[PDB]
Structure 1
């Protein structure tokens, strides 16, 4: 019996277990300490106890462990991990462990981790002598990612539009910039659901920081893969720490010959959070941002990479535009040109209720020749030579009302080719 299953159950199951097990008053406190108490009396009863979660190392040599669906929050649900366990299984931050928990001694509260039955989804003995990060190296994106499913739906139309606007490959470095109310939420929604449906093999990660809790919870119930989302209720320290642990566990996952794609919202928010958390270096630029507060987001954004021997790490991230804050532009043109490809959206396109509000002319990609074949290569060079002359929004309505009558994209290619 692990903590994961009763955590995943709603509050009603916890309550009913409470009356069934002697906890008559479980409707007063928070979820974490309530499950803490129920696990306490479980350990009193001697029922088998199991643990699952990711372990990290704090300033001291001792290590803590945290769960997945707990929104990656450290609290009473953490699990002890001694430095000896770290040494003898070469453990590090960002590793997931499925190991039986242990009834704590008197005076200690967390359930200590007896030993690891598996390390990062694989056996501990292979993890003891396992590939390190030095061999994991950044390659250009080669394998095209498909986001088209085919149902004659607006989300499918947006997916096809973004497919024809710019190719998305495995292990690439993509960024999105858009004004407010330009359609960010549903675009990230359809790209996430499309990469989940078309590619069940690759794990799906969606990152949300300082977002409204409602958008957080409606991303919780929508995406099939696990989603991390720390709303603005938590302080900036929680957001930043979630950021490094999630990016580093994604790095550990891609270290295991596994394709990982992480959706980031938003790079500007984490930039401001890093500026808040980092000490002042005495060299402040325009907008109240000092030099050392830009390197960490730069390292985070540059972590996107593909691997030659196997695996890919695709960071697809969104950035804010013209929100009235000058440091937003400071980081906008401080991050400019640092990605593999970019997606621009505009205000006036979304004002006319034309969706998606992507800018075909402004959006582009570098090194399309390697990711695609010659036939499709010329098949979108014809696209942008046809579309570039006339207006942007005019081309938007042209493509939305001409692509809609075609079920697929290839058939669209031939139907417009004869024209």
Structure 2
């Protein structure tokens, strides 16, 4: 029937679906093997075999279609694309392609594409006249992504503090500096929830590089959007492949005047994987040329004058007792235009947001706010300056716990 519906089915029902079709015990093979067997058996109807995926082009000239539900993992259920079709349709890596596929005739191992229906959710002759991404001109963030919601809750305090400390716009390049066990995953989840509720017209992407399986399951079950991850069991080439696929898909989407947002956890471990993979001078453990590829990633964020935006919010790790992390953090310093610092001292006393107010801030705040809002924010910033860290956080929490919408709190200091 549909490949997408087949991939989105629990394995228990998938086994009984193939048992009714005369297939023997499929309970001891992997999921993709079951999919391949079911597809190979249901090869009698000349139609009703539909498939879609994201294109990856190998260095030999032929390409494959990959699926995001397995995080673009190569397997037996991929779709083969010939170089002739690539020349025909001006195809490029990162393009989403939908259409019809056909079984392998003989001497082949993969299903092949029969007819192209949509490229990048558009007509094939319309998605070959778009201008490239290093062909557009970048601007500042002359727009704004509001985070705070209206309902009075406890999870809204973090969003309100974030809104008061560092505004966020479309096209930002933000950095979060986090010590160990300071509540960073909760911050990312809160930001994702706020983006999902407030702005349903943008495309949300969450990237995890070197996590643990339980965290992957929790993030997949909590986030409204696309979640792509790789665990620490896999080699580094897998991390590199995932990162490149995600960035190319985002670029192709931006080419169509869309707004894309990416949340990246531990750019540090991406840099470490690139250091592992890149061929071999040394500055304390890292290669000088090993940091070229990650920066390109971080360098993709910009506001497009012709229309569209790409926002990247990345996490950096400090105070882990490793020279590599310190070198990576010192090299990546000063490249972004938004900073957010977390503190261990506030986290030891069990204060929830644990944000360092006096260190945070964004460049070019005058373009994301009105005159009155900027004046009120300056007035608020003047008072907090002499205070300490824990004192400032306790003051902010106590004051913000009374009224809502960050308006009635500004009228309570008349």
User: What does the per-residue CA deviation read over 1:62-91, in whole Å, with 9 as the maximum and x for residues that have no partner?
Assistant: 111101111221111221111121122111
CA distance in 2, matches of 1:42, 1:234: 33
Deviation per CA, 1:66-122: give whole Å up to 9, x if none. 011112211112211111211221110011111112112222222111232111111
**For residues 333 and 371 of structure 1, what CA distance do their matches in structure 2 show?**
29
CA distances 1:180-216 after superposition (whole Å, capped 9, x unpaired):
1111111000101111110010011000011011111
The Cα RMSD (Å) is: 1.3
**1:100-146: CA deviation from partner (whole Å, max 9, x where unpaired):** 12112222222111232111111111012222224333221121101
Q: Deviations over 1:305-347 (max 9, x none)?
A: 1111211000101111111111101010100000011111111
How many residues are aligned here?
A: 414
The 1:286–1:135 alpha-carbon spacing in structure 2 relative to 1, beyond 3 Å, is closer
- TM-score of the superposition, structure 2-length normalised? 0.97
Structure 1 window deviating more from structure 2 (300-309 vs 284-293): it is 284-293
CA contact (8 A) 1:286 1:327 kept: no
The alpha-carbon deviation at position 46 of structure 1 amounts to 5.1
CA distance in structure 2 between the aligned counterparts of 1:340 and 1:399, rounded to whole angstroms: 24
TM-score between the two structures when normalised by the length of structure 1? 0.96
Q: Which moved more, 1:118-127 or 1:133-142?
A: 133-142
Contact 1:2 1:52 in 2 (8 A): no
Change (3 A) 1:313 1:286: same
Cα deviations across residues 13-71 of structure 1 (Å, max 9, x unaligned)?
Answer: 20120222122312101111111111111225656211111001111111111011112
Alignment of 1:305-344 (within 5 A): 305-344=302-341
Structure 2 unpaired stretches of 5+: none
Moved over 4 A (4+): 44-47
For the 8 Å contact 2:71–2:242, the answer to whether it is kept is no
Give the C-alpha shift of residue 225 in structure 1: 0.8
Encode CA deviations 1:197-249: one digit per residue, 9 max, x unaligned: 10010011000011011111111111111111112122111011110111111
Deviation of 1:178 (Å): 0.3
In the alignment, is the contact (CA less than 8 A) between 1:95 and 1:252 conserved in 2? yes
SS in structure 2 of the partner of residue 330 of structure 1: helix
Report matched runs for 1:265-344 at 5 Å.
265-280=265-280, 284-344=281-341
Equivalence for 1:380: 377
Per-residue CA shift, 1:260-312, capped at 9, x if unaligned?
000001100100000011111xxx33331111111111111111111112110
Deviates most, 255-264 or 86-95: 86-95
